[PDB]
Subunit: 428 residues, 4 copies
Amino acid sequence: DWKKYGYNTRALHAGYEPPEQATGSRAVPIYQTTSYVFRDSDHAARLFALEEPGFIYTRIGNPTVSVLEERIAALEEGVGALAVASGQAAITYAILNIAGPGDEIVSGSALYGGTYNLFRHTLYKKSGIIVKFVDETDPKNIEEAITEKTKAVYLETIGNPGLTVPDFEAIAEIAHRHGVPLIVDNTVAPYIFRPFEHGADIVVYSATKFIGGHGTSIGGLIVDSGKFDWTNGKFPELVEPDPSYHGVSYVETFKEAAYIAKCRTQLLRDLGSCMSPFNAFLFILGLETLSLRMKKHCENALKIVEFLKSHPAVSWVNYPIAEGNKTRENALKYLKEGYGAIVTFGVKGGKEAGKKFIDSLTLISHLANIGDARTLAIHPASTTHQQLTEEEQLKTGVTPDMIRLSVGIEDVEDIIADLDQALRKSQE
Amino acid sequence: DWKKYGYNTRALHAGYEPPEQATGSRAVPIYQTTSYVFRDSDHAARLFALEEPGFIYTRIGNPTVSVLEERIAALEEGVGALAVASGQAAITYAILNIAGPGDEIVSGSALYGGTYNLFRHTLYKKSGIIVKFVDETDPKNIEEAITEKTKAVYLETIGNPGLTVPDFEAIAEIAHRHGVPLIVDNTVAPYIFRPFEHGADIVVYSATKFIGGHGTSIGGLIVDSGKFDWTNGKFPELVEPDPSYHGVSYVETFKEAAYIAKCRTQLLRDLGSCMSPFNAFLFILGLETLSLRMKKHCENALKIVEFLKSHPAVSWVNYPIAEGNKTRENALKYLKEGYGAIVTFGVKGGKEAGKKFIDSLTLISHLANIGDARTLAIHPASTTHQQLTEEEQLKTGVTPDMIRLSVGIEDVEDIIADLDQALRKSQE
Amino acid sequence: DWKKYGYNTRALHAGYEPPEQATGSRAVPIYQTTSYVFRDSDHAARLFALEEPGFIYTRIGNPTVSVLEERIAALEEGVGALAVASGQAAITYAILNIAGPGDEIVSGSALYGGTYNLFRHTLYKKSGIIVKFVDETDPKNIEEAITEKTKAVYLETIGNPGLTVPDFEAIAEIAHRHGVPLIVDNTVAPYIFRPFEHGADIVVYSATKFIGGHGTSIGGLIVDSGKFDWTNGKFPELVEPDPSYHGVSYVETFKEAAYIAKCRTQLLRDLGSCMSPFNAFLFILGLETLSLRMKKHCENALKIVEFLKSHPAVSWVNYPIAEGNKTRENALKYLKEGYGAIVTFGVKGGKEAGKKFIDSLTLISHLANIGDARTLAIHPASTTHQQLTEEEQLKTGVTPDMIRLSVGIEDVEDIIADLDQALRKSQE
Amino acid sequence: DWKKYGYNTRALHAGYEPPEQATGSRAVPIYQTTSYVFRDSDHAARLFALEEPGFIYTRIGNPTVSVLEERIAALEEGVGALAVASGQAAITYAILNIAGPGDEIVSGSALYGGTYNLFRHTLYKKSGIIVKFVDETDPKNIEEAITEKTKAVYLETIGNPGLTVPDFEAIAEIAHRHGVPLIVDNTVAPYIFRPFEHGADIVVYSATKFIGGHGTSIGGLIVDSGKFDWTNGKFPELVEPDPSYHGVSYVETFKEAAYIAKCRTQLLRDLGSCMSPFNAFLFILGLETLSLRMKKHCENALKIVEFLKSHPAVSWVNYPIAEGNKTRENALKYLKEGYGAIVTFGVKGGKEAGKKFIDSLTLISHLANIGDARTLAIHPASTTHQQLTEEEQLKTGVTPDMIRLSVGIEDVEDIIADLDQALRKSQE
């Protein structure tokens, strides 16, 4: 389905209208298959030469996985999407598509720990890429770090768990004036934020979190807006003839889809971070309720915040629109549908009190995740961010006394009662 | 289970004895979950610091996926295995674990097309790695290409579809004398060949093909023999303190498992090519019959070869032990359980006759795969190897008139009848 | 979880707190297994004798299926539930548990076609049970049909598709004064109606429809309120010693759970209508969003009704609270959360116009189902009710010109636009 | 595929040639769907009236489930099959299709406990059917129990666990001379026995056991040979017009498939024991290796028997061809491919020694099942047959000191070593 239809209609229909014509299955089939029989040899040759569309091999493309991709692109109003094995793989592929040995990336610092470790260590040692980390709360800091080796600017929508919101439009202008795309990780804010409306060229998701929403499946997505001009000379693999496809120019053959086409034909084909069709089936199920779920997550989170602000065992609370938040103005400007499910706070008595808070919980789940329907809590400095030095954790908005909550869609009075009994026990 | 038990007992038990203690499930549960609740904060901290074993997050580790890994390691007599999203990802990770920008790899040339394209283009452009391709039919050619920048030697067990078998022991000696591991891709010969018995240090699989065996699931495996010494100075990431894990030395903490540990803790955690637990469940089912299946594949293939050799529309036939095969001696020496399922031949009348052969088939499936229970046929020069120049295809053992068959486990008289009617039609 | 927690908290937690202790999986594992290893022979004997709780065999009981059952019982505030292969099997088992050859059942006539055919033909010919059908819009009609052979009264919550709502409290009093339970089929109104609050003793569900909510899985549920007294002499199988379990009296051993215990130990064990653990996994996912989904279904349906009432191609519209509905008073009294997703209407030009309405639709799915997230339409007289005579269809509230809609959770303006273009085309 | 193709070719192809034409999926898709969109209203009407073939609703029919059914029918050389939720449901439906209140069934007594309990108690109390149990080791005993109320004769292929084999041809003649079909439960002997070659008219399977073969899925099958004449006056529901389908005569419309058609259209539609498409997918995977698996099961079992016969802690051993077996002649005559996987024996020291045997095992699984790839052991008198009196257990071939083994496909020396250490411990 198209831009003329509403978000919820797309979330239920896009990419699977009409149903497959073999049997009419209303539900998207799970095509748990590796291979696809060809009509004849000409079919088979056209498919491999990129001269006709069809399925060849599940590593490269699969019908269940394609419905997921098409529906995500429709919801984002992008020109195409690619599904991959994890949010990490989506980030990896989004960068590696346009960068390699000797290249630079300007990144914000309000980052999930796993992105930090990929950027700072793995991409440098295994791909020769230098990521330059900046305080994205001031857009001038992004401009000052761009160089002729920069290939992209990278931001998260709501800094997990710093809870800062960058000025997307200002930073997108900076990236475009310097001839590079803005890539946004919108993991924590599907539906409530549309990056392509605000300057982003590329969106990645950890479909694992909110998109799936039920804590069952690992997966990632890369979405291409199709509006960046790859021919400025900084992205020659998207322009020059590709020896692997006998001379194909991606911009020439695939036009506005050049980028997501190469992600598939080069990186997915060769590095092989494909999603399972079963996992795709479950993510499609998640999308069908995503907007209802996100509205409830965000309504509960705002209530949780107000509860915590007035509680005697709590020393501070953060939320994208909290009074002390340095980017609340950006949160107000760009998030008009809810301000995310993630809430941080500190317990009086520091790290050891937070320890006893976590240990006392009876309904909230002490685990490593966000974006489950259930409410989740953790201590980031010793978990999601343990790979970082004390100085590094502070750059990303992570302190030693911090508790992160991913607020779920339980009845809020039950969440608050678990929080209260556990906060009382932490002061004993 | 251990080295004292037979292959089939291990294939049915290793890694899941005793059954999980929650309910006693005899079958391996499908843990379709992202996360795992922790006992308390100390548990959670020990797990992330690598100070205690347990599950944290399915990208990094999962109980269903772990049973698969443990059973593959037991069958291989390796010290550990890692599961990943595809055979391509396993190859990628096996190399990237020990190589990066400016490094070299010596590879054989009897290679699946997808490995060629990863080696020649993707790893060079995205990782700065120079793969040097050699004629592995003479081990002297491997020695002559090693340099001080070489990090590994790479071979396939039965060249897909050149059908050549390298001299593993001679090449393993060369690699070890030069301080680098031998990595073997044993995709086409699980059970019938044990690389670790013949000098290989690392084995990778495309679990997709024969291990799964039913054409349902994409997946890869990396298996570590645990016998290579990573401390010779060429593998400093396996020895030096890792900043991402606050100073952990992989050889010191994980000893013989240093390599497969870093594959998990670095590459899987950051690049994110994880396998789905559903896919793992299906690969475990495949292992339970693998030895029966491989014996039938190889018995049928040898019969198919004899049929083709005497048929009037066939100009030539290849098989690892065919009289004209330049490495039949190696095939005889190393494959004592069967000589693989893959068979090549040429039709009289060249490419256009093979075209009409493929188009006439009625039971054999014209698709891109090997290792299905069903019998498969294809024309490689325009498909699995289309990414290669005419000169390059010839280096890998692929001609323009070649038909590749993956012989399945149907009743051989039905396979032969389909082959015969289609060969008659190709001469019209 | 317990009656102290809210509906949404239960829907996310009940039956799986704490997570399984083997690994801590936050998601409910898919235990796709037939069998469960026993600790020793005493364990195994106690389990089969009904002297200890545990798992023995998936036909009889399974850990994934048990979580589903426990969560449904918690949401219903029943004492237990049983999962089965379909809504039809749940109805069958709910009756067969308490009735057999020579017994009677008093049923309402506002019935899904499949229930009618089971009641009128299959149970009579294969079980000797006489179902007496009555106009349940007047409770006096239920009393007048009870006899000393009656074993239960049976009602649907919202007559599918007559859209009538019975007076539950009045009819429950009648059944209880005559010593028989009231069994309610609450398929179309989970969450929005709680039968046990209004006199029902037994609830059955077609988990297929709204509970699943995504059109993926067939399944049924039987829920026992635990408040009916089975010892009045009409239910001797629940009281007398059971030879199959060496003398067990169900009321004595299982107390308030006697009924659902026999459903498992007798009917599920012997007739074998078990649910798959995969299907159960998906129904659990459905429950996690059920209340959000049902509120949206009912809000959209009420809007659709208002649209249809004012449209020139529509001759009439029905809805439980429509002005002409003979039971709107009951709908107002008992449904305080929404009035269901099902809407009927007639097109001007009769059966052939409705034909052209269905044939013109472009977003609404012409299929046999209700309770999908997508909007569905059909012509019942030739489909869901085709097994009934013209007189019989009229007894159930089905006319020849009727269109049934199951209103989904798409954006209502998109539903209405599809309805309007198709209604215009029907008048051409 | 057809009778011209071999068993293994059929097991890999029948029912899914050609692959679905939407995408060409070589693997059978998992159609996890409830519903199927119709082309238009005429389509929808023809489908419900039984005037055209197609899919309507997964309770009644599903594309994945249909491939399973078609492949089983092809392997059996039957005219059709029906899939159901369990082996118990298949037995139930096979009888209820042709019998009801006041009818009789002549059954053998060499029966799985669950069949006994269905026959003796559940079908009598819930369906009014009188099963007459006879010593089927003498065919004269079958003739002497037939009456004008008899509707079928029922046998198991290898009495589980009496291990007796009836004289199928003699008993089939008796049933046919008296105008009733012979129904065979071939659960324990797929592939190794073809009941339709020896007089059976109807075959049922517990697909759970050997057909699946991996202990993952519950399921049943009913297979119709299509050769019984239902018009002799004893089966009027198969001849007379069916009110539920407006006058359809099953023999007239469906001809040789009348029986399996009514199983679907009446019993599956109304009692609702449908199989999940996921479970069907797994059973199809099992079929692909069934013949290799059964040959290995039977070869290992015969070796286990010889080991047990010579062991000092064993007092007796039974096997269909054991020297003391009263039906070894029948086993020799009818089983020409292997004599089943099931082995019974007694330990010196009686029930308490067998207790200590079971408790000592370290590789063989103490669970309730047969037909897993793994080797299984149990004590039937307190488990699979606990529902029967001491007299009743003895009628079925079950004593108090009996150990039943389901011999798996592990390496036999590992099975024997587990058996030996556990037999030594039982004598302490």
